[PDB]
Amino acid sequence: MAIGSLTINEERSEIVDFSVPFVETGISVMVARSNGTVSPSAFLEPYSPAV
Amino acid sequence: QPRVEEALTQLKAGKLDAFIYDAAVLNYMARKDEGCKLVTIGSGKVFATTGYGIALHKGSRWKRPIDLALLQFLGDDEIEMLERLWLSGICHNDKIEVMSS
Amino acid sequence: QADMIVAPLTINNERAQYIEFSKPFKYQGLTILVKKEIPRSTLDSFMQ
Ligand SMILES: O=C(O)[C@@H]1[C@H](C(=O)O)NCCN1C(=O)c1ccc2c(ccc3ccccc32)c1
């Protein structure tokens, strides 16, 4: 056996057989934390056009 | 970037804008990070998703017992506890935080 | 009555003891769904 951080692959599947995956692996994206805006149209917001 | 840790520093210094790698090894580094300044967008948007697993000998006849037992932990809530272990961090990828600047 | 199931079918351990599965073609969880609540402040009157 080869328990570890082994990613299931098509090429590896035809030379060795794997088990049911216990951890999901994909292709993700990082980014720095966003500070956050303040809805630049905020001044007309705390009311309604009817009011 | 030839080093995973070095790429983060370049990303944290504004040199880069996005580091792309495996979810199971990049989510852990996003969770375990001081300041919680790194957030991923791999919330179900992971592309070409293949899980981990236990390799065998292609005829080892251990596949069925291993799969049955491994699915038992996944069927139960066993693997989740091990995820709250090492594969976790103090930082939360979820926002759970409001800032007024 | 059939030889091969092609449909969203979650992998478990009970059913795995009578069949053989394949590698999943999609990964998903179980998230509670609730009706979205439209925000509206009560504020009965300015007298409140
Ligand atoms: O999928 C990959 O690219 C390979 C391998 C495979 O099946 O080839 N599958 C698993 C991923 N991986 C790697 O080389 C790799 C790359 C980087 C880290 C780790 C493991 C732990 C870390 C901890 C901190 C920073 C980086 C790492 C493994």
Swiss-Prot record, chain A:
- Sites binding L-glutamate sit at S5, T7, R12
Any coiled-coil ranges, and where?
Answer: none
Q: Which residues are glycosylated?
A: N35
Domain of life of the organism in this record?
A: Eukaryota
Its biological function? Component of N-methyl-D-aspartate (NMDA) receptors (NMDARs) that function as heterotetrameric, ligand-gated cation channels with high calcium permeability and voltage-dependent block by Mg(2+). Participates in synaptic plasticity for learning and memory formation. Channel activation requires binding of the neurotransmitter L-glutamate to the GluN2 subunit, glycine or D-serine binding to the GluN1 subunit, plus membrane depolarization to eliminate channel inhibition by Mg(2+). NMDARs mediate simultaneously the potasium efflux and the influx of calcium and sodium.
Q: What is known of its domains?
A: A hydrophobic region that gives rise to the prediction of a transmembrane span does not cross the membrane, but is part of a discontinuously helical region that dips into the membrane and is probably part of the pore and of the selectivity filter.
- Which disease is this protein implicated in? Developmental and epileptic encephalopathy 46: A form of epileptic encephalopathy, a heterogeneous group of severe early-onset epilepsies characterized by refractory seizures, neurodevelopmental impairment, and poor prognosis. Development is normal prior to seizure onset, after which cognitive and motor delays become apparent.
Assembly and partners are described as:
Heterotetramer. Forms heterotetrameric channels composed of two GluN1/zeta subunits (GRIN1), and two identical GluN2/epsilon subunits (GRIN2A, GRIN2B, GRIN2C or GRIN2D) or GluN3 subunits (GRIN3A or GRIN3B) (in vitro). In vivo, the subunit composition may depend on the expression levels of the different subunits. Interacts with PDZ domains of PATJ and DLG4.
Q: What is this protein called?
A: Glutamate receptor ionotropic, NMDA 2D
> Corresponding gene?
GRIN2D
Q: Which portion of the entire protein is included?
A: 535 to 585 of 1336
From Swiss-Prot, chain C:
Q: Which residues of the full protein are shown?
A: 509 to 556 of 938
Query: Coiled-coil intervals in this record?
Result: none
Q: Which disease is it linked to?
A: Neurodevelopmental disorder with or without hyperkinetic movements and seizures, autosomal dominant: An autosomal dominant neurodevelopmental disorder characterized by severe intellectual disability and developmental delay, absent speech, muscular hypotonia, dyskinesia, and hyperkinetic movements. Cortical blindness, cerebral atrophy, and seizures are present in some patients.
Its quaternary organisation is:
Heterotetramer; the NMDAR subunits are modular and harbor tiered domains that function in concert to regulate opening and closing of the cation-selective ion channel pore. Forms heterotetrameric channels composed of two GluN1/zeta subunits (GRIN1), and two identical GluN2/epsilon subunits (GRIN2A, GRIN2B, GRIN2C or GRIN2D) or GluN3 subunits (GRIN3A or GRIN3B) (in vitro). Can also form heterotetrameric channels that contain at least two GluN1 subunits and at least two different GluN2 subunits (or a combination of one GluN2 and one GluN3 subunits) (in vitro).
Give the family, as the similarity comment puts it.
Belongs to the glutamate-gated ion channel (TC 1.A.10.1) family. NR1/GRIN1 subfamily.
Which residues does glycine bind? P8, T10, R15
Domain commentary: A hydrophobic region that gives rise to the prediction of a transmembrane span does not cross the membrane, but is part of a discontinuously helical region that dips into the membrane and is probably part of the pore and of the selectivity filter.
Q: Which organism is it from?
A: Homo sapiens
Q: Where in the cell is it found?
A: Cell membrane; Postsynaptic cell membrane; Postsynaptic density membrane; Synaptic cell membrane
Q: What is this protein called?
A: Glutamate receptor ionotropic, NMDA 1
> Organism's domain of life?
Eukaryota
- Post-translational modification summary for this protein: NMDA is probably regulated by C-terminal phosphorylation of an isoform of GRIN1 by PKC. Its phosphorylated state is influenced by the formation of the NMDAR-PPP2CB complex and the NMDAR channel activity.
Describe the task this protein carries out. Component of N-methyl-D-aspartate (NMDA) receptors (NMDARs) that function as heterotetrameric, ligand-gated cation channels with high calcium permeability and voltage-dependent block by Mg(2+). NMDARs participate in synaptic plasticity for learning and memory formation by contributing to the long-term potentiation (LTP). Channel activation requires binding of the neurotransmitter L-glutamate to the GluN2 subunit, glycine or D-serine binding to the GluN1 subunit, plus membrane depolarization to eliminate channel inhibition by Mg(2+).
